[PDB]
Design a protein around this ligand. Structure first.
Ligand code: TPP
Ligand code: TPP
Ligand code: A1D65
Ligand code: A1D65
Ligand code: SF4
Ligand code: SF4
Ligand code: SF4
Ligand code: SF4
Ligand code: SF4
Ligand code: SF4
Ligand code: MG
Lengths: 374, 273, 106, 184, 374, 273, 184, 106
């Protein structure tokens, strides 16, 4: 169990290199530039390719084209940059091309406060593209998690064949300190690569799979020849406008993710043992919540709970429903104007309390103890 | 390559779908012929093409083919070629693709000199979406969105790509396929960014309202507009109004490919740092 | 490649665009009428004895429908002025085959 | 309602362009009508069609109703094979035998008539593009939904004065062949 | 009351010209091209400007720049085009520039089936931009409404100073028939222009308004000089990073829309008089619902109701809550995988029935009567 | 125009914010001087600028100013000018603006010849985001994302805009403000698309790691790179390596403005149709 | 906890860059530390600062706590005027009198010391960029959180061998002026 | 514009980039040391009597600090080789004023 000294972006880059990423394309923008400055030195040493393109559209297009051919790749941006990749994110979702997109949040709407922290891309990344879409998004909450959540993001992108978002924050992104990370050899054991069909038996069927599992996309330039397009396609890849195929395609794109729900979403629950209040909150506000709950207990009463999702989308609707049916007082804390509160309220079928702040500053567990008085 | 075109084709797809006389099957024939003439193996060739009516070309060939979004063929192709820097990648797009919505990507691909084989299918309008105006439509012509006469000006793709920094520039048309294949075979063997401007004919959507509704009237007009390179190089500026020189227009031989230099950065990256 | 046939047409891939007819320097090709097809006209080889070995027709076809034999397997004809005169007479005739070409079912 | 009509063809023919004239005609006559078409991404050579809904009351749903289209007029095989099933049992069908051959069971089911519309348009009248007016003549003459004089008016208010005088000649030839097609 | 013969796109264009639009910028894409082909002939005749740009980004940028100076303008696209304007939509929302965006829906995700009908941009247009956002979106449902909803869209964009979406559909967009539209003179009476501050008294305060009303933006080149930017700004327009101003700005951007809630959202209710079932459904599925409810009543029993929203966002949460508390069986019909069902279920705090179809085809009131049997 | 610069400035904003010696206040001074020299009234002038470090210029002037998103200044300006086709619009952007992320908009603005006054502030890197690589950075220089030597190639904005179809092209620098103002005054009076390439200095982010950390070292380097137009026009291709000619490089006089032709389409639109 | 430290300045000075060295030092010593900085959009000439949290246990909340920062070291006026309030009553402050002048009430409240850090860095040592090491010396010498030898080690493992030998000379001058500043 | 002053520098707006110093051909400008500001150096006029009407200093000021009187209400000096020599000796002095220059506090 090796332990190091770095910040969030160095850990994201180290995890990306160690899990096996060998390609990166991007366009510079703060605060998501440190990952590019790290990958540009880390990738040539291991034989990978780093390229800086002319905008964000090209940045995501070259990464999609490199991972189409069988190379593990990623990209990264922040806010106004992610707003420019949403036409290619749909191409990645429909053609089933694995890609990991790291988004480092800052204060929005358009440029706004380019040096401040926010949590405003939650409802945006719930459904960023036109048409229908099924998101997968992870939210690191410390320095140990900036590493393992990135390994998990790569594993999920290779297991589901879909674009996975990594919802980093400027706080964790720039926060510096001591970290503990797993064993390198133990990280290498747990790696999940995409599967390829060999046979003699040419592929004949990249997209002809069952209704609850992804497609098998063999690497390019190896004898297995197929078509890759962004339209409603058939078994080998040629477009169609049939109703049966066009409906079953989207049903499978949804069911291959909503059937792995027990492996996909984790979540952290603490002190839910006879508590009176629950303080559902995600992201880096978890850092303030875990200290408010550490101070408030030593002068006061009425034990307070905490339920933190580790995978935002798809949401743990059943566990939220159970917690809401069990306990009488809930409190949602966020750094926006009520974005993830709507999901917590459509689950639980009930109105709850809210404590939001969208002025570019953090919550400061003084305020949290002051709000638990109500 | 010859009366046997079916080795390189997804024969179950043909007959094609274009109209009846589009100058698009001629370019496909020429591409297949020049691929065979060079001794290339279709297990090494990839063909990525944008969306439009030249985007159907990536459906009929029997290789690893890709069909991308509008204006992004060159970026996907850059990625594919960079991840496999020993195989042969060919890009096919129209004039409303990489010169209208994707002119930025084309200019930067010319600039950084990636070993691609861009091939522009130039028919002077947007054909798929029923005759809108292109950046290459001549002035005074009836288009669906300029119904009194087009007043926007024109691009010269060859001059623009030359100014950006391409290493091999060439122009030809579907009015002489042998010269088209000679140009293609000389440009495929080049080891930088090769740009081919190919004048095609759209008689159904362009010439139909400009009284070139037959294929042969459009073909004679296109022939009248095209002169050789030395013909053009000798005429006076009095005389070069709407004339286009054909042939190889630039073959820089003292240049450096992109991946050939990133390999040097790779070797001194951890060749003991 | 069949024997003895210098050039032949596959009327199931012909679309009737007249471009093969417009490049023949010998008047071998002529566009024929068939009401069973959507465009109405079809290319039809009429004088395959004056077929020169220029494959312009096979190079100028968009739909892969006209084919010419292989010089290693065939002895083609030579240039004559009757043929060029006939080619011009055909071009001045909407690329269709002449009325005197029906003299024998050519 | 009263009528569900369908005009099929192939991209670039113009036979099916005679549908919206019929809707205008029923509208000016004092009723209601509406049309919807079905196209492809292929510019020329692909199957196309239109549906038409004519009535005495308001029209709410704009789409045709599965399995009881009344009248169908087809000038191609790639589309007559596609959109063949939605006709009711005992409906009227009108084809041109130079480009469509119905199956034996379609002869069982429908009331197929045989009129070579495009040969009529080219050989007799003189223009290829008069086929729309010819199809309109046969449509109005067989189904008999709108009065003929209103159809003449609403047609001739819609085409240039270039061919307006030959347009009546086309319409008369069409009506004549339609009356002649009542061979039974 | 003049009555004409046209389809949805001709009516959208006629309403846009008659209410006073004098500028249009766009990029061609099906099925949203007929509006551009109509405006390109209709605008030069009245002295307006039509320009076709090189992409969709430029298409929306020139329209924003023309309406910044005091000219009523619009734009239009479809799916993959709207996915490219979401960086400038946030600039329009933050700088308070009136613009009307017409979106003609087709089958998604990417390209997909470019000739088919869908209702998949609902949850996308609920929150398309990063940061915080408050949407306004109208959904025409017939040919009479393709005209009046467009007049209303222009009036709301001028009254609220915000980007308003017009959620047209391919069905209504291409459907052709007879229409009834109001009097031209009566349309000219009801027109709402934006307000301008004259004084002698130079402007001195474009953005210094109360907390429940929009800003006053005088035309350019008239003596009133001010700054227009996309960052958190102050009274005259110069950026700031203050917490007070940056918070009150977003509070006002929300409250100026959620306080006009009685004028903003209309909705249509029929047969809610002692009904047993309610068939909430919007858009052009309303055409099938209104005929299923016309046939099913003449052989059966158990009166069925219908509640159709005319303004999707912001949603009529209070009326939905009341209807859900009153009636016991509800049924939501859509052309997606459950997009507007989530709002109907977070309101009403209750689970309801659903009938969706995302294969590129319509619903065909045969199926609706077959589903009312349950 | 002179010791009284405060008539044209939002004096409450100055002192400015750039660094201590950036060549950006010099261009602002020159713009104000050439505006006064022409007799323009600030109630007719609009100044739209992109986001970056040259985007602060639209904050200090006292007119109707706009600050747009990244790479879109030219599109907003096109709209503003087209809706008010009698006033004076000026665009200011950097080299990572309209030539990297907005090169498409610049090329099409040159092509269609809209009466704008594009002014490029060229400092050879991305300054605001701390020294990333530009499409105009010379090879071999240390940048934050190329830490062994930049290997991408360069743009020539003047040659590229000339190939696109601009009517007035000119290059100058902050090393001679009188010539800068003469060029600006000749280009503002022109009635088509005027493009000005202005070489500025970024000693803080570019020269600091290339050992040009002072302002005067960077200024001497920039002076060594720049020769006059006839100097350059006489030297041999042996000698024109990394040399840039300055002055007016193109002043087409037989041309047609965009709005001047859309007015003709307007007049025959319903001048009795 | 134990300490909440703050280093202010102006964009482009380098005095405040001595903070993260202190965090490394407390970490290698056997404790915990973490830092956060506050910058502006202005590259040079704008106010900047850093906060540091050193402790014997784990650190959960990374941000400094309002109104009881212990030690504050300032080398500018535009930032000493900004971030002045968050100090506790009776904390230690260290300014350079050539660029900061504290108010009368700040002299009431804090324990201000007066050391011209940049003049020490330039006039005595020789390099402008040694001011970070000088500030580090005064910081370690007044607050006394981490041992001096560990700080020397963790500093000299972090700068090039170019100026490593003069870095001790700078540190000694700093510690000397700090001991000399105990004038009371 | 006060009387007699050919050029005066606003000590509150200058930033210390040495550019107006490096462009004056009469050695009139010189950079002295001022600890009260961050950069440390500040521009001060040294020989305002040898001022030439060239406004190169005001044209090379990116911070709106140095000003020059107008020709209409002032009489400027003439060119001299001692002045050019002094300008060169100032330039070779890190754009600071010479040690010799302090003889009167210039
Ligand atoms: C993702 C997407 N973007 C845009 C469009 C609209 N569109 C598709 S093709 C085309 C025009 C074709 O452009 P061009 O490069 O001229 O091809 P051509 O027909 O001339 O070969 C348009 C506007 C689309 N169908 N899909
Ligand atoms: C929409 C958007 N895209 C990208 C960015 C990132 N960004 C903003 S300014 C800038 C760099 C400025 O570029 P340049 O034109 O070179 O300014 P310069 O430093 O040269 O003056 C970047 C990368 C952004 N803030 N917003
Ligand atoms: C028999 C003949 O000479 C002829 C010419 C044409 C046709 O037949 C067509 O059927 C057609 C269809 C669609 C577009 C153009 C044409 C055409 O030009
Ligand atoms: C006194 C003096 O001669 C001088 C030169 C400089 C400085 O003082 C700085 O403080 C500085 C800060 C950041 C970048 C460059 C410099 C610089 O060149
Ligand atoms: S519309 Fe034009 S480009 Fe498209 S297939 Fe037909 S001729 Fe070719
Ligand atoms: S092979 Fe040559 S001569 Fe024979 S028909 Fe073809 S073009 Fe004419
Ligand atoms: S070129 Fe071929 S497809 Fe075209 S008309 Fe001639 S034979 Fe037919
Ligand atoms: S970083 Fe460069 S462009 Fe930005 S203010 Fe400093 S010198 Fe000017
Ligand atoms: S030009 Fe002005 S601001 Fe710059 S160093 Fe000289 S006096 Fe100071
Ligand atoms: S006014 Fe002229 S001579 Fe006097 S100091 Fe300035 S540049 Fe030198
Ligand atoms: Mg085209």
């Amino acid at each position: 169990m090796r332990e190091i000294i770095s910040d969030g972006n160095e850990l994201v880059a180290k995890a990306a290199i160690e899990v096996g990423c060998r390609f990166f394309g991007g366009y510079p923008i703060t605060p998501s530039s440190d990952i590019m400055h790290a990958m540009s030195v880390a990738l040539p040493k291991c034989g990978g390719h780093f390229i800086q393109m002319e905008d964000e559209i090209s940045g995501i297009s070259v990464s999609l084209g490199a991972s189409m051919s069988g190379t593990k790749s990623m990209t990264a941006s922040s806010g106004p940059g992610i707003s420019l990749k949403v036409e290619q994110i749909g191409y990645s979702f429909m053609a089933e091309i694995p890609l990991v997109i790291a988004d480092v949040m800052r204060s929005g709407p358009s440029t706004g406060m380019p040096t401040r922290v926010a949590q405003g891309d939650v409802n945006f990344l719930k459904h960023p593209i036109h048409g229908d879409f099924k998101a997968v998004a992870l939210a690191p909450a410390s320095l140990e998690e900036a590493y393992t959540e990135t390994v998990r993001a790569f594993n999920l992108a290779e297991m589901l064949m879909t674009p996975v978002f990594l919802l980093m924050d400027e706080t964790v992104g720039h926060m510096y300190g001591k970290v503990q990370i797993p064993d390198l050899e133990e990280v290498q054991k747990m790696t999940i690569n995409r599967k390829e069909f060999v046979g003699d038996k040419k592929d004949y069927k990249p997209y002809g799979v069952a209704q609850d599992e992804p497609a098998v996309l063999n690497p390019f330039f190896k004898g297995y020849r197929y078509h890759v397009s962004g339209l409603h396609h058939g078994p080998i890849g040629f477009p169609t406008e049939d109703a049966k195929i066009g409906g079953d395609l989207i049903d499978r794109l949804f069911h291959k993710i909503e059937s792995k729900q027990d492996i996909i979403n984790e979540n952290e629950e603490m002190d839910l043992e006879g508590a009176e209040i629950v303080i559902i909150a995600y992201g880096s506000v978890s850092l303030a919540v875990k200290e408010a709950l550490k101070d408030y207990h030593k002068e006061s009463k009425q034990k307070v709970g905490f339920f933190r999702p580790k995978t935002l989308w798809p949401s743990p609707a059943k566990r939220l429903k159970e917690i809401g049916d069990k306990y009488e007082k809930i409190l949602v804390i966020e750094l926006n104007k009520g974005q993830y509160l709507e999901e917590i309220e459509r689950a639980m079928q009930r109105k709850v309390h809210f404590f939001g702040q969208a002025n570019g500053r953090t919550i400061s567990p003084k305020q949290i103890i002051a709000k638990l008085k109500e | 390559m010859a009366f046997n075109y079916d080795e390189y084709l997804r024969v179950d797809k043909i007959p094609t779908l274009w109209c009846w006389g589009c100058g698009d099957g001629v370019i496909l024939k020429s591409i297949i012929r020049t691929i065979d003439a060079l001794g290339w193996k279709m297990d090494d060739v990839c063909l990525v093409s944008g969306i439009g009516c030249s985007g159907r070309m990536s459906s009929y060939v029997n290789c690893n083919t890709v069909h991308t979004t509008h204006g992004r063929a060159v970026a996907y192709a850059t990625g594919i070629k960079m991840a496999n820097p020993s195989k042969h990648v060919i890009v096919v797009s129209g004039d409303g693709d990489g010169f209208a919505i994707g002119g930025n990507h084309t200019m930067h691909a010319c600039r950084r000199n990636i070993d691609l084989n861009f091939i522009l299918v130039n028919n002077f309008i947007y054909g798929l979406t029923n005759s809108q105006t292109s950046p290459t439509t001549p002035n005074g012509m009836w288009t669906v969105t300029a119904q009194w006469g087009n007043i926007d000006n024109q691009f010269d793709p060859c001059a623009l790509t030359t100014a950006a920094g391409a290493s091999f520039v060439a122009r030809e048309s579907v009015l002489d396929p042998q010269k088209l294949e000679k140009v293609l075979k000389e440009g495929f063997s080049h080891k930088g960014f090769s740009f081919f401007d190919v004048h095609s004919n759209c008689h159904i959507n362009l010439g139909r309202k400009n009284k070139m509704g037959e294929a042969s009237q459009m073909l004679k007009w296109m022939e009248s507009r095209l002169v050789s390179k030395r013909q053009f190089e000798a005429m006076s500026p009095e005389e070069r109004v709407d004339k286009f020189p054909t042939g190889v227009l630039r073959h820089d031989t003292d240049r450096k490919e992109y991946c050939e230099a990133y390999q040097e950065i790779i070797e001194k990256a951890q060749g003991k740092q | 490649t069949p024997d003895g046939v210098a050039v032949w047409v596959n009327e199931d891939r012909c679309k009737g665009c007249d471009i093969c007819v417009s490049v023949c320097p010998a008047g071998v090709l002529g566009m024929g009428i068939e009401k069973e097809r959507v465009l109405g006209k079809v290319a039809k080889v009429a004088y395959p004895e004056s077929c020169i070995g220029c494959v312009q027709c096979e190079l100028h076809c968009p739909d892969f429908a006209i084919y010419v034999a292989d010089r290693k397997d065939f002895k083609f004809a030579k240039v004559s002025k009757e043929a060029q005169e006939r080619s011009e007479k055909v071009k001045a005739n909407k690329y269709m085959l002449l009325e005197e070409t029906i003299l024998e079912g050519r | 309602m009263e009528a569900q009509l369908r005009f099929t063809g192939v991209g670039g023919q113009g036979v099916l362009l005679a549908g919206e004239i019929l809707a205008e005609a029923k509208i000016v006559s004092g009723g209601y009508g509406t049309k919807t078409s079905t196209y492809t991404s292929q510019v020329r050579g692909g199957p196309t069609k239109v549906d038409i809904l004519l009535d005495k009351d308001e029209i709410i749903f704009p789409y045709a109703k599965e399995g009881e289209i009344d009248f169908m007029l087809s000038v191609a095989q790639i589309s007559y094979n596609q959109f063949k099933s939605d006709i009711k049992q005992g409906g009227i069908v009108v084809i041109d035998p130079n480009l469509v051959t119905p199956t034996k069971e379609d002869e069982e089911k429908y009331q197929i008539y045989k009129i070579p519309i495009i040969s009529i348009a080219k050989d007799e009248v003189g223009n290829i593009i008069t086929q729309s007016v010819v199809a309109l003549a046969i449509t109005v003459e067989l189904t008999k939904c709108v009065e003929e004089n209103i159809v003449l008016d609403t047609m001739l208010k819609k085409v240039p004065a270039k061919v307006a005088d030959t347009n009546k000649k086309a319409f008369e030839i069409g009506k004549k062949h339609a009356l002649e097609a009542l061979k039974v």
